[PDB]
Amino acid sequence: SGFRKMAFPSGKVEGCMVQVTCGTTTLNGLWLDDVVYCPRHVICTSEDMLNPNYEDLLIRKSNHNFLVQAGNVQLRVIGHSMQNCVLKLKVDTANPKTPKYKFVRIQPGQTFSVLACYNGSPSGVYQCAMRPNFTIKGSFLNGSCGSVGFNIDYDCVSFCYMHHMELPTGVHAGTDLEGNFYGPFVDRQTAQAAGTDTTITVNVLAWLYAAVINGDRWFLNRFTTTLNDFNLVAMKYNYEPLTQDHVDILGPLSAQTGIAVLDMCASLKELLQNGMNGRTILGSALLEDEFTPFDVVRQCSGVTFQ
Amino acid sequence: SGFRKMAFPSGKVEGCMVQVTCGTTTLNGLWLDDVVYCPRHVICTSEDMLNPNYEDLLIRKSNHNFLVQAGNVQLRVIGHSMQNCVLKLKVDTANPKTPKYKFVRIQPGQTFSVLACYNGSPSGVYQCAMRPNFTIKGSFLNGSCGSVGFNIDYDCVSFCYMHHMELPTGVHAGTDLEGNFYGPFVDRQTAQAAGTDTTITVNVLAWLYAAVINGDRWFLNRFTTTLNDFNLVAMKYNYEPLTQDHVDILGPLSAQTGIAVLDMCASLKELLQNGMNGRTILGSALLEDEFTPFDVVRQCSGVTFQ
Ligand SMILES: C=Cc1cccnc1
Ligand SMILES: C=Cc1cccnc1
C-alpha cells in the first residue's frame, strides 16, 4: 500500500536530453534519431523577445549558429527547420539511445512525468497534470526551457510536453512536441495570464478510490445522488462536470472497492459542502485532483515498463 | 518557480535493477559490478517466513537455486553470501551499466528517491523521507522487495535503502545496502509495528522558506521567539526538537529570503497554534516535513547531475 505522486522511470528520456546553445541563449533539446527538438525562442535575443517574426529570425541563422552538446560530445547541425513553436535541428548523428516513442497531445486532466533539465542535464523528475486551463503547475527555473513531459507505456515513451515559459502566477505553459501550444499562450512577451481554472472532478473521485483501497474510509456514506444533482454541486465548487464516460472509466475502481461511482460522488459532495473537519485523506488535507483513474489503477496494481 | 516533491532522475539505477527468483519467491535485485544485492528473505518459503534461521537456510541453497534475470538476459550465479539481511549473489557478469556509487546510511529526516520495481522492471519513481521512527511512507505492492532508495550527487548514486516489508499501518521498513535494518524491525513475521513518529521540524522550516521563495508570505509575522521557547511549542505538537545546527543549516535560506530563522520559527509556532484558517502553502493545507534544506535549495536553484 501507500499512495505517492509517482513519475515514470526517466532513464529512456534522460539519454535524449541535450544542450542547445545559439547566441546568448542556452536551453534543453530533445534528441531523437537525427533531430533535436527545442523551443524556437532559442533563436531570439533579449530584444527580439518582445514581438518576434520567427520566420525572419530563422532565415538569418546558419547551421553553425546552433551549438548542440550531448553531454561532453558536440553534435554537428546539418539542417534546421521550424515546425510551429519548436525548432527541428537536424544533426549528423542519430541518437543511439533513441527509445521507441510517439508524439501525443494530451487532454486537460491527464497527467505526465516531467524531467526537468538545465544545460541538457537532467535535474529531477516529478508528476504533473495538464490543468483545465492548459497550464501546468510545474517546478521550473531559468534554463529549463526544452524540458519535456512524457508518459511511458510498456517500452514506448509518448512525449506530450515541451516546456516554454513561466506565466506571472508561477504556472507553466508549453507545447506538444509538434510545436503547438497548450492553451491560448504564445512564445512572445505579452501580458498573457493563465485564465480561470477548475478542479478535475474525475481525478478527485479516482483519488477517493485510491484512499478507500488504502484504508481511508471515514468519508464514505450511505447516501447517494444522481449524476445531475452531483453536477449542480460541482458547479458551485468550481469543479468541472462529471460525464457518463467519467463514470464508465471509474467502473474498475468502483468494482474493486464495491463503492458505486454515484455513491462516491455523494461522498465528494459532502466533502465539498462540509470540508474535512481536521481529518486527512492519503496524507492530504485537500481534495487531490492530479491522479487519473489510470494512475490509481497503476499504483494500486503494479504495472511496470520495459 | 513552483515546488514539487521531486525525485532524482532514475536512469542510472534503472540499469542496475534485476529480477531474482529462488523457489517460489521473486523479487528485485540490485546489480552492481559482479554482485546482485537483494533481501535475504528470498531464500524463505511461505512456512519458513515465521522464525527462520537464515544461516541454516542458506547452506541448503545451491548457486543454481538463484535465477537472476537482467531483462531478458539470464545471469549465471557463481557465488552467494549473506551480509546481515541482504544476500550478495556473485554473477559471472559485471553490470556494464554500473554507475559510480556508494553505500550510505541515511539519518531520519533525510530524503531519497525510490525506484519502485516489480520483477526487476522499474515501475515508478518518487521521493520519500526516512521518518523519525525509521519507517518510510512509500508506495509498495507485493513484488517490490528489493527496490532501492538513492540520492545522486553529480554522477554518483549513493544507495541508501533496500525495501523489505510493509508494516500493518501501511508504512515501509527496510535496510541500508549493508543489510542493516532501519529501525527496530526484523525480516521475520512478528507483530512488529512502526512505533510513534514525530514531524521533522527542520524540514517544515525549510519548506516554509520554499514557500517564501515562491511567493506565499501570508504566514510571516513581525514576531520572533527564542530557540528554547520554540522547542517548548514543538514538544506540544509532537515536533521534534530544533537544534542550533538546524538553525545553522537553515542560514542560506534565511539569507536568501531575509527572514531570520527564529522569525520563521515564530511563524511555525503561530501555524501550529492557530492552524492555517482555510489557506494553503505551496498548494498544501498541511505543514510539509519531507523536504530537507538541501531539497529546497536544490529546486529553488537548479543543481543537476551527470
Ligand atoms: C522565470 C523562470 C522560468 C521558469 C520556466 C521557464 N522559463 C523561465
Ligand atoms: C503487502 C504488500 C507489500 C508491500 C511492500 C513489500 N512487501 C509487500
- Indicate which residue of B22, B38, B41, B163 is catalytic: B41
In CATH terms, are A15-99 and A198-301 the same topology?
no
Residue B172 Cα, gap to closest chain A Cα (Å): 9
* Contact assessment for residue B42 and residue A212, using Cβ atoms and an 8 Å cutoff: no
**If we measure between CA atoms, which residue out of A215, A190, A199 comes closest to residue A268?**
A199
Ligand 1 binding pocket (C-beta < 6 A) is A 140-142, 144-145, 165-166
Among A126, A298, A303, which would you mutate to test the B interface (most chain B Cβ atoms within 10 Å of its Cβ)? A126
* Contact assessment for residue B144 and residue A301, using Cβ atoms and an 8 Å cutoff: no
Enter the CATH code of domain B1-14+100-197.
2.40.10.10
Experimental technique:
X-ray
3-state helix/strand/coil string of chain A: CCCCCCECCCHHHHCCEEEEEECCEEEEEEEECCEEEEEHHHHCCCCCCCCCCHHHHHHCCCHHHCEEEECCEEECEEEEEEECCEEEEEECCCCCCCCCEEECCCCCCCEEEEEEEECCEEEEEEEEECCCCCCECCCCCCCCCCCEEEEEECCEEEEEEEEEEECCCCCEEEECCCCCECCCCCCCCCCCCCCCCCECHHHHHHHHHHHHHCCCCCCCCCCCCCHHHHHHHHHHCCECCCCHHHHHHCHHHHHHHCCCHHHHHHHHHHHHHHCCCCCCECCECCCCCCCCHHHHHHHCCCCCCC
* Contact assessment for residue A136 and residue A172, using Cβ atoms and an 8 Å cutoff: yes
Helices B201-213, B261-274: crossing angle, 10 deg rounding: 100
CATH value of B15-99 in 2.60.120.10, 2.40.10.10, 2.170.120.12, 3.30.70.1350: 2.40.10.10
Enter the CATH code of domain A198-301.
1.10.1840.10
| Beta-carbon separation of A285 and B285 below 8 A | yes
Resolution (A): 1.9
| Distance spanning both ends of chain A, measured CA to CA | 23
Residues of A noted as catalytic = 41, 145
Tell me the C-alpha to C-alpha distance, in Å, between residue B271 and each of A94, A135, A277, B234, B246. 55, 30, 17, 11, 19
Annotated domain spans of chain A: 1-14+100-197, 15-99, 198-301
User: Which 76-135 residues of chain A touch chain B by CB within 8 A?
Assistant: 115-119, 121-126, 128
* Contact assessment for residue B29 and residue B144, using Cβ atoms and an 8 Å cutoff: no
What is the side-by-side order of every strand in the sheet holding B35-39? B73-75, B67-70, B17-22, B25-32, B35-39, B86-91, B77-83
User: Which 15-74 residues of chain B touch chain A by CB within 8 A?
Assistant: 15, 71
* Contact assessment for residue A6 and residue A303, using Cβ atoms and an 8 Å cutoff: no
Nearest to A1 among B3, B170, B301 (CB): B170
Q: Is A105 exposed, middle or buried (0-12, 13-18, 19+ CB in 10 A)?
A: middle
